[PDB]
Design a protein around this ligand. Sequence first.
Ligand SMILES: O=C(O)[C@@H](CO)OP(=O)(O)O
Ligand SMILES: O=C(O)[C@@H](CO)OP(=O)(O)O
Ligand SMILES: [Mg+2]
Ligand SMILES: [Mg+2]
Lengths: 436, 436
Amino acid sequence: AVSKVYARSVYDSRGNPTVEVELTTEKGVFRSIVPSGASTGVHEALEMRDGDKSKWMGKGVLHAVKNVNDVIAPAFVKANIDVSDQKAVDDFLISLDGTANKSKLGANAILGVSLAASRAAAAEKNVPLYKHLADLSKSKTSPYVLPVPFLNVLNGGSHAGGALALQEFMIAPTGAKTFAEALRIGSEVYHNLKSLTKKRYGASAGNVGDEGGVAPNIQTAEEALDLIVDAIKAAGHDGKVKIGLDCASSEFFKDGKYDLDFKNPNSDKSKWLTGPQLADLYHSLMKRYPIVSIEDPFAEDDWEAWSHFFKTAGIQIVADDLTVTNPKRIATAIEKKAADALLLKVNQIGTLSESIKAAQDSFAAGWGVMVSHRSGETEDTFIADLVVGLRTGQIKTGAPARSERLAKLNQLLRIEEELGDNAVFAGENFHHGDKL
Amino acid sequence: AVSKVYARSVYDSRGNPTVEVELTTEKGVFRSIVPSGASTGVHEALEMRDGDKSKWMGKGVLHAVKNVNDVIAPAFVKANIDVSDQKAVDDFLISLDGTANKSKLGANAILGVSLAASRAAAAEKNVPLYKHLADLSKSKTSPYVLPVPFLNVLNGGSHAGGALALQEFMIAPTGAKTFAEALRIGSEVYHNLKSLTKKRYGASAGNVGDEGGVAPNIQTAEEALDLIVDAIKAAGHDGKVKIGLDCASSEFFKDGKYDLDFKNPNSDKSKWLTGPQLADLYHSLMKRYPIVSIEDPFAEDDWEAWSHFFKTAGIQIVADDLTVTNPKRIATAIEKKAADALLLKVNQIGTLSESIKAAQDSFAAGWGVMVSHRSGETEDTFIADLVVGLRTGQIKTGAPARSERLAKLNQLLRIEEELGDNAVFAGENFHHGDKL
Ligand SMILES: O=C(O)[C@@H](CO)OP(=O)(O)O
Ligand SMILES: O=C(O)[C@@H](CO)OP(=O)(O)O
Ligand SMILES: [Mg+2]
Ligand SMILES: [Mg+2]
């Protein structure tokens, strides 16, 4: 029995408020903290902020906080919902909001409750959260799969600049034999990266992104990937480490074109590329560097450049803003053969049921699932349990810098260790972690 | 009854290994994560790392990990120590090491056990950790004092450069009426700072330090404090926000002189200052900006420049590297009247007893106590409970950016809220938080 449902305002990795939910049951108080993901992806559950500019820069979540405390708690207590029954919990949460995008009560007020409920159902079940999630998702747990961590080491996009349009440059210790080893290789390479970085670009090139990657003032992607390959090498792990890219291409999408040199605005145009021309630039990079994954290569409604590139990619194509974790958007992506992997971001749909539900359909179309963090993270380790229970084989939780990030990586350290022989590391099979 | 004492390797905010201890009792498993503080302070408990350069860059703690697992656990289980009895726990931990500086077993292997024990004693006591700590420290708890957070917003020292020698520039929302309000004011000012920063110095000036402060490439301290005062103003909180400085002066101490322009090395000398000349520069800054605290103004064995400045300071003088949390070093500092506040860093002495014990003597000499984090933090919130239980009135846990940091700030959010009317916020009385 759920006896109390409460919420408070706390801070995220960026110093911006967010919602914290506490759920009391006969077994104790369960907490959840929602991520404040830089919002980007038309067609996602809406975020609810005060907009009061004289407070938190207008990013308070005092409403959302209210939505929980004054609206949801009362009704939820009353409902006497068996927390074990996750669909039941989310159906009830969605029923109260009544909008398709959670804009009445707001996706931050609903997630919190939805994530706390699952923790309270694990305690009651007397199982570790990953196990509960395996059970809600009807995933194989014989053995459990630990995933490769896609670590953001070098940031672009949002963080600084030259023309380097590209957003995230990830390393994936695919060659590791354990999660624990993948993280060490990961870390070793990362430190290398910083030194190489500080030497070439200045001590300043060294301070980090929102996610922990160094944010050197670079021009081109080549120059970025050259920098990373030197760190792999230097770290002594050539061959064990692969690269992943997050183009976050909606970002430089203009006039049906793509601007690989933004940050002028002497918006140099004739250089601007078309779906197909970009496709060629990607293919270029593909052969020159050990890239095994590409997220958002084309813009979010640029259905034809996706479909077209996908035909000849030959590597994992991750859909993040094209699908915004919306099964409606997934189904189309699936029928258009736009990609073959889904960036699962829970606060994009706003409910745990809905999140599992979207991974389940991705997995049934033979897609992979990269579980993901938001730009604005917390100390909450929910996504560590989540990639394991879903058995995806891959997670993107940032660089091995900032505890909003190590927090999840440390958590997998703990899960792996606890699983003993019952866990196998995804490695080279990260993409179909689930079929493993 | 302590039934098992185990340890594993996990990561810190910097991606460098550190020790994690798990203590099993009849009430459950208690955990502690030790901070990897950039070591600086001759005369502190020694840090224990593998030094194996082919692993973790030679920063493994696999030994330390071993010291716990193979040496300490066995003996500790056997000892059948009442965890309630903290001195007893630490006496036993120190007895096994037998060095004054914890160099046999290493201060990281001993801290972990010492911090887990206290959490296991709270659970058993059935009180919240801050309360247990109040009890171990024999501190007033009527009411409890929430402290002002000294938030690192702008970093120098270790992070980048011009000549700006100074290390940390802190903001202290002294004028707030609640902790919850101090953090908001704090955060509001911080975001302001970033924008001002990005505008004047480039998008790059915007990425952050190890602690979360922006790390603009600045020259002088004036230019740094000018930048901060504009953010206070701009944020609309002039008068409520005060400044704290961490000169970390050991850093530019050379030939009995201080180099305020390091980063040449066309070690420009005739400009180099003497204790007294620096004292004058500080006094300058003191009148020009709302500075209410200064940490490490003079070098760690530069006893005479401290004593001398202290005479006419008229603000809080924090001893960090001069005292390295060593009561032996404190007593001297006290008899020499070098400072009037102690930076308590637990992994500097290596035991909880020893830490409380040093605050107790600082407090008896009429000093204040600023509880502190390390450069290399974790998701562990131990220091939040610790500043409250000690009733210091002040804590330095970084900027309101990075969860190794918000993690402790969120925790105080929670404690304040739980204490209800039983907690008063230190405010303007942060320095003698304890007499309050
Ligand atoms: O974690 C993510 O993948 C990033 C973008 O890919 O999140 P945000 O959208 O908040 O920047
Ligand atoms: O937290 C601290 O005060 C800093 C220095 O003052 O720690 P470190 O010594 O690790 O840099
Ligand atoms: Mg993306
Ligand atoms: Mg210091």
